[model samples]
Target chain A: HEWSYEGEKGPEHWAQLKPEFFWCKLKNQSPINIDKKYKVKANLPKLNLYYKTAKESEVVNNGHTIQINIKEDNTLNYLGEKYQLKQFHFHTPSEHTIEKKSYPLEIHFVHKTEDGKILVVGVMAKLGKTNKELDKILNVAPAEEGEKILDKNLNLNNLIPKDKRYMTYSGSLTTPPCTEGVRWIVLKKPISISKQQLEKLKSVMVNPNNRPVQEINSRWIIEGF
Target chain B: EWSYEGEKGPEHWAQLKPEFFWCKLKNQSPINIDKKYKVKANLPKLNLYYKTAKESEVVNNGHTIQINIKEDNTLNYLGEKYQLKQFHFHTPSEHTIEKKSYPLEIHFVHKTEDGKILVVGVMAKLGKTNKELDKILNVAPAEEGEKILDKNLNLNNLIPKDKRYMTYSGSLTTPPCTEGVRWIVLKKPISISKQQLEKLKSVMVNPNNRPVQEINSRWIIEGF
Candidate 1:
């Protein structure tokens, strides 16, 4: 059994390498190179945003990406209004940009309105001081597969940046079986966590989880700038 | 409203033109490169596999990938075989090797027995001919979150070469990403229409999908 190099044992062949190791190529894919010229202007009305505490949350090493499970219900503000906060996840690297800089980690908070419309908020994370909440996350789960931090009793919503000004656009989920028709809210503010925090997350495995930037097609780049 | 490549756009950003969009300093990342090197013989077993016909398959704007409704019945072969059932979607990619590829994809098949599972897999193209892929692309419905696509789909599962296999223990690769699961990635690749790819990628607003490949820790390597 030799290690796969480029042009040899790549992802395309993961399933063939072993039988039980099939999920490697089974989940929905992400991050396709997108053309910014086609972004569509979202017409969905904005939702008011408010915060809620996570009743309980846990991290799992589902043999692929490290994920945080938080049961939350909240609100958020959009278009000079408020929308509720729902749930979010981390996509390594990130799925959006800030002044042309792409951070190492971005979390998308999925919010919905009474009308059943969806609004997603994307926030960026940089490397700097220790992130207490993130630290709580790492200390509990420690990036180990099947590892979970359930006792932390931390408010998952604390991960959001205080400054709410953001970029608005219309786009689809960054992954395949990529579902479209979701309203997007990309925060302009970035939060910093210590390099140690990153190391802790990376310690679980290699690979950063992230979807590719998409085409900003036929859409308006509305900045709360 | 300036275009990304024109004024006030992505083209003007120095990172876009850098030697490596994947450079850590550049902040842009590519699919995981072959990082870990340990290979194990006691790799996890797939335990199941199957392939079935599907109707909801279509090619959109060079987006080449498909899915089928698989059965969960078990098969009694080798040791114990699982019945094949429905398979579905995941974008960008689900696995990683070392380098030279991205724009990942996935196929979910199932089996009821321990020795078999159904997996109908495909690739992502960057250009035209993705019209057929549009069916699943549009049907998968990117908004209502996740949809169970069970329509009749005409797909070509013969694209993958039977040889080349790269297996390992990994996470779900997506949210709630469960790790310790079995992975058997294909070594060979097939071509897809480019236009279809363009249409599909146009949705993601940013080209930042895919995690880097994790350590090949004690993973199995065969079928090359």
Candidate 2:
């Protein structure tokens, strides 16, 4: 009942010691908002992503926020480049904001370009119905590592909204070692999971995984309608 | 945490009733062999059932066990044919094996056919993941019902193995003890939620709603 990971896992400061994140050393980062609204930039072809439910796994109390190791079968095309879906994680209270209003949760879907550029798709979660995938994972939930769940019937489309509206911007990774020059595509339509689902996620991720909002500076926030 | 139907709820049972069930009831119904088993042609069919997560709103104290109003649902053919799915409680143990066995719990999934009939499903409490309460264990779960989650999900199929079962012809009203119709008991039963049970029937009940275990006297035990 008592809330852990209070200031320790607070977004602004994540890892002060984990040296693996060489990118956290960068200055130009994202989750930043630009006041200057640019007119629609034509010719930036919309990217259609394909994904599948990877496998079911437990949230080990890793030193950081609770991480769900999901391998999405997704193809991302940006700037004449494509990438495959890797995995996703969550950061409570969201690392990004629209018009400065922070949501309850955000899902970070990490996809890497062939040249190895990390293209992260951020989906904000709202409170609503129980996520079928999360429910399945809770029931018959796996306890050990390397447990494979065959969920071919799982539809990834359920994870995304119909509008497909997104806010695309070039930014750096949110967490440490915070990297720079990452392309971020944050969907405008927020995905939802039940409040109980949020509680379940909290039970696993005692430590917070979010980073403080980065200064928008002179960046362009483009809305791909 | 204090326990009951209202303030000082499920958490306050053990401190309240220390005797009525064991050292309390005038005639405590402990486990005994039901020697007088007769083959009654009038075995009631289990037709329907309605389960409510809210217990206090549903159950009223019966003579022996606490009884709830029956709500109906469709039952499969060659299936349990009660117009409703209602369960009454029995404690300590019911069906005994010639004075050698023990059962910790018993419930009757009701069905009505002709003039007064009862199909008693006897269950022994064991420790396993197969507890009856496991169905809603995750959904709307409670310590003393502090948290009520509003979501409708069918957890009716969470029963343990349905194959192993026992049947017999026996009594009607348990505890007050009256003779009646077919008793179809599941041989295999999932474990009862210990904390949840204590929160409801036994140490949790106001005056204590648990009935002494039914006597297993001279009852013809049919195993499947």
Candidate 3:
């Protein structure tokens, strides 16, 4: 009864596919367009990225995205709150677009705060030069779905963009049960990848792994410039 | 009156139409950018405003796929504001940098109120998939003269983030080969996946490049 990323089993039917995925139709969804016109000052403090010792535990092509499960050694601190790194995945055409402009790729760094709260950081990708850091992860990603392979050399610093400026909002998990109340921080600047690297990633990932952008409704989009 | 076939290809364009005699003239477009001759300087930033624009019409004009853009989308640069009229593509890229060809070329055609024309060319290198072009490529008609109306298409998505460009004076690469056109070619090539390029090539008459022209004495300015 699991939902997929396309066809009748896609996001549209996720809510009906299982009772847990009901949040897919609920308010406050993830991957909403962060239009500059709707941006408001959140006065949020700078995000302190702590991944000094973070390493990739395993990588799996989850029949959706290339999920690189990692050891919870990394943490992100903001506003005196810290979250432990869980796992991250890839999405094509990006789930979110800035001013309706979608990038070639997007990465979601999922983390968990105390009290069971969820926080995720999203970074977009543009096609330009190459990044050596991503080569490590891409090298270990399985072409087929399921059964993660062990890879301990993953470097989280290479995954995050150098620019810390970002936009924040409250949204839901892109996947089903599509849980809400997740704090989302989307980086303002984009990282670069060679055309070849992008294709390699796409070759392993399920084509169009991203969920369509949902309506913002009444949620406030906060930008930390 | 010309075609993409043997007797009517770009080489014979000048003979096909008398008006296209300029095709053999000097200052033709798609000239190679010789890095040795390029003068690097911080040229004026290209002021391109494409937000809140209306949808466009996609036309397979036999020769290539063109997007007939609506008005209100304008490009302000070099003390003149040129209104974006339409954009089109060429396979294997008509323009090259010192004899190196890219996978595709995108031309954003603009004209000023005074009738002067300015073209902003952004080359597409084989890389990642371009979602902005998926809608157009998905419905791109194989036959010439076929047109598709896309009401949700916003061209802003196609503009590259790195605005640094190389500028010069050149003529149109197509028939009529008109001259006096201002050219602004972005330095950074946008990403288009190999699969997407293959799809685009499948719809076109094989090998649409117009062959590189002579640089002559024209100066190519590089804006970093």
Candidate 4:
């Protein structure tokens, strides 16, 4: 029952570990290679993000990734459905790749609908400006498998990218139980993260936690305007 | 991709097919009926809005005898409405009650508009002859096909009087054995005569029931 991202318990062995995760072998898996081809620009709904700075937050080292839990009204309006922001976590060297190109870091702002459906917003980090707000949580990270209060006042508005350009698809969680039917929106424009800041998170997270890119299958990669 | 005996049986179901891997999962269903008791808050009662239909179609799909009825037969549970797709049978039962097997089991498979699945399972034992089952036996298909009939049968009569049941999250008993199915197995079993049971076993595959799976890491709640 102990599944890991390394050794024999990695992604290839996920479905075999248990029956509940048999969906791991299903057609619509996540962290796919967002190829240049099959790109369709759709008149899709906008990301009506109304996320304010988290008043109180905590950084957790969940043995899998660095997860930040916040108590706020951070929500996303999509297709007339309201999905409240639950937790945001990170994966180093990226999970999803554009034109099969990897990034320094990737952040997933996870949200959930009324009936427990998931729709995650993905932001890739490019090497440039130092994300001081992101560093606040990183600096306060428990360093190991633990949880600690993030007493710093950090505005989430600065963490999210301004560019409205995005690519959307139907995918699943990159982790275990790899539940399918999750809606993912990977931002076309990447946010800036300094090289030094990347190393800080990498060493803390122990090098790589990124799941390998999966097949695209018959999925449509919609390039939203 | 489905079978109950020989090489294509339960032992190799998870390996002999695609996505059938759910058969090897921990949260697999059709578990033996037994568990710790916990009372739930606001537990939804099953609302069977079943309407008797003059028109019904019965099929002997080489697996079991299935009655594809009108969409009027539906179940409402857990704030979701599931349309009754079809009802099929299994010989010697699938879910063992306290490790005891019944003569028969009926699975009323239902589906939501959003593609979720819930199955209402009712056990049947040797008792007074079921008149509705007798009607089905009269026009039961001998071939691997379906037969449309104008039979008068009350759908609700097929279900037991007691709505109280043990509800748990399980998987489809067959291939691709998809999980996330809401299982409602009635505590009260219906009656089926010895003659009716014999005919039912004749019309379908012999010993058709898939054996009960492991109840690991899951709790069967007593829903009142």
Per candidate, native contacts kept equal 0.00, 0.00, 0.00, 0.00
Candidate 4: CAPRI quality band? incorrect
User: Candidate 2 residues B1-224, lDDT tens each?
Assistant: 32224543333333455321122211122334343322222222333233543432223333223333323444432332444344444444445544544334446455545324345454545454433343333332222232232433232422334534444434432322332344555556646555545544442223322322432112233333
Give model 4's share of reference contacts.
0.00
Worst 10-residue lDDT window for candidate 2 chain B reads B19-28
Candidate 3 lDDT (Cα, 0 to 1): 0.76
What lDDT score goes with residue A221 in model 2? 53
- Give the chain A TM-score for each candidate: 0.70, 0.77, 0.94, 0.96
lDDT of 1 by residue, A1-225 (tens): 221312354445544566433323432222222223312222233333446566567676654456676666565655433456555666666667654567888877766677555667777898887778877666766454575656766665567677766655444455422433455667667888788777777777435555444433112334442
True-structure RMSD for candidate 4: 13.7
Instruction: Name the better of 1 and 2 by DockQ.
Output: 1
True-vs-predicted CA distance for residue A196, candidate 4, Å: 22
The Cα RMSD across the true interface for model 3 is: 24.4
Instruction: Give the residue spans of candidate 2 off by over 4 A.
Output: A1-26, A33-43, A55-61, A71-73, A138-154, B1-224
Q: What residue pairs clash in candidate 3, if any at all?
A: A21-A177, A195-B127
- Give the docking tier of candidate 3: incorrect
Model 3 chain A: weakest 10-residue lDDT segment is: A36-45
